[PDB]
Nucleic acid binder design. Sequence first.
RNA 1: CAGAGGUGAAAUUCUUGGAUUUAUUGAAGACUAACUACUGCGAAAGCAUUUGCCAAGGACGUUUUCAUUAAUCAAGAACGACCAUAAACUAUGCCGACUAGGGAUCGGGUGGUGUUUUUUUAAUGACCCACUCGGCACCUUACGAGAACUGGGGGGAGUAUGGUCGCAAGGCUGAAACUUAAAGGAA
Lengths: 177, 118, 230, 75
Amino acid sequence: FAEESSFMTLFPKYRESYLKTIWNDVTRALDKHNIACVLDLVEGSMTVKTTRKTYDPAIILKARDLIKLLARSVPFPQAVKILQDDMACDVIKIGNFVTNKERFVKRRQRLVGPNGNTLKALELLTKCYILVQGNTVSAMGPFKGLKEVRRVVEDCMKNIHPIYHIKELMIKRELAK
Amino acid sequence: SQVFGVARIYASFNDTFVHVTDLSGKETIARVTGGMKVKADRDESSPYAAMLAAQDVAAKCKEVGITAVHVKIRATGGTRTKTPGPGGQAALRALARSGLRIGRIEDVTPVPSDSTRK
Amino acid sequence: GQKKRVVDPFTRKEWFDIKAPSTFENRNVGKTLVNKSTGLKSASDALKGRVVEVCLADLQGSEDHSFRKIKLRVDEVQGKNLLTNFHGMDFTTDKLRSMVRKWQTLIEANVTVKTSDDYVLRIFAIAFTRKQANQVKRHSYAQSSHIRAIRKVISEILTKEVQGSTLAQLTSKLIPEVINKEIENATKDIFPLQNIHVRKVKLLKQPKFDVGALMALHGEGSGEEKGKKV
Amino acid sequence: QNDLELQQFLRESHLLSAFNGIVYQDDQVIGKARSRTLEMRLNRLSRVNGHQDKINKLEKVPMHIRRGMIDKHVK
RNA sequence: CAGAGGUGAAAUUCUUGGAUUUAUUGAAGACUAACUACUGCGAAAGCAUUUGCCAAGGACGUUUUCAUUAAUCAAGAACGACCAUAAACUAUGCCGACUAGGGAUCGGGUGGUGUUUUUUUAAUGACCCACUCGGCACCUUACGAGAACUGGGGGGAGUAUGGUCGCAAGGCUGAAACUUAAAGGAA
């Protein structure tokens, strides 16, 4: 086994009525990996702990990513796809790119799209799940998709439009097949 | 009873590094990266390559006399992705499966703390 | 071109083990390789600069120090033992990322203080603004003059805790987290302030060696050893 | 802006993800995605010259259940 | 010790004169992560590490003072020979001389009377509640003529064309004055 591992994130207060609901499903989905987890509702935190029966050494890292995904407000059937080996997170940072607030919110809304079309087409092409929240961009997926969405988001905070990247993603799929 | 090294797994995209040193970090015991086990030049980051690299790491650590490793798992960090590649969990799993005991897994990627982007 | 042929470099390697200072609990922390003690770079001066990063849980037996790694600097070699001294302290990154939450303020301070020895230390501090029980507004921000006053009393009382300590006294002071209790008691007149921590201690300059002071930190020892039998 | 396949994929990205690598191009799109995709294209083409009281005819739903449909959807 | 970048794969590049990785330390130029908000400040462009100095500013409090010193804007003023750079790109809404509100939040003030605070060193908090002034927004309501870096043709979707201006076909090449070689094409 291992000695002990313990990670903890702490979640904002409005999430607790959702996390209280889904929490038994988290205990099922982690007790099949032999990882304990507590949901503290007074200090507002979620901890995961490697118990005495954990033979997978690396799964406590994915449990850490799962609980901070739950804190960063992705839902549960989306977030338990992080406990499998082919999938990981990325948290792109978009705040430090441009100066004025008007150009920042217009490029970030351009990253989302009209009716959400640009973002949904990006999720479809990269096979990822992308959340444009605040001044960062969360993403879950395979690593090729994560590389693709990171370059898409950073070049969208630079001045080139994201539908150029969506076009070249379609071209590259029909060019790779 | 255990003798402890440290693991220093640096798992970027495009490559993984499984590099056991001593408890200080000054003396190395079998650095073998992912791209030197099997190279198609694109499978360097793959879980198979990380498992091969961690397996002959654990061979040379059992040769020298290290029974357990403290795992320090880092990504490329900096002004970049901060997420460990597909090889980090595979190298950790192969290090544990090949006899070495695991202790103290910690995430030491360089968060850039106000970086040099623009 | 032509590269090199290998000759196995673990036949010339020597194993030392690291004895921690006696300001801790159980003091055998592990072992360390070095090249074999030849003339022209003896091993006892191939060492003496190495710092090791150990866990305070491994140094103290408990698990509420599972964060808060520390650094021990090798100073004096005797008899296949590396006697160490305190070299610094640092949190793991996951601890302060687990502490930072939005809708509060983090007040962080730091002071560069010279102790009762001539070690000069840059010592840090973090503190997060709590909300009281019965508080119904979701914010609990400090009004930034409360931040300046809190940071002022943090700097004053922790530069009072140093200069009034040696390195061994300061280390034994910050093992059971009691400078944090001093900050909390001295600051609850201004803002509530959950989970104050020290988080980071850096050595900047160190005075001299003073083998007597190091051996008084550890314990005595002197050898008359074996004799050749011809 | 005058790429047709790209913009069709953009505005039919939602129901492709609702009724699904993925397929998007016609000659590979299986049933309910195909029916609603073709219906969306025909609506968008016919909304230029056709009358606004004749292009988008609502399905006849009774009052007390269409209002409840709207209230639950707005919730 | 034999590879490291990087890519969808590659490559330019670095590398047994030891790259990449690891540890200790130094130097440089930037930048101020998370905290970071439909929050704050600024006339706007804009402004995020600590501490100090320099002047400034706003809101509040005021049984202080002056006594019409005021409001709007054309004109004008302030701010906005070396090393080479991006901006917009799907958007929104009914306006003003205009009534009331509601929840949340930022700064000040008054009152209440509980908990954190606490004591004969100075003063000074935090939260809860009501009221009130002033802000950044948001969600609603009721009621009004709201008239009197410059250059522009005329709707949208199409259809026809014995007009005008163009561009475009033939037909094995060689190969025409020559029924002509080699070689190539096609089948």
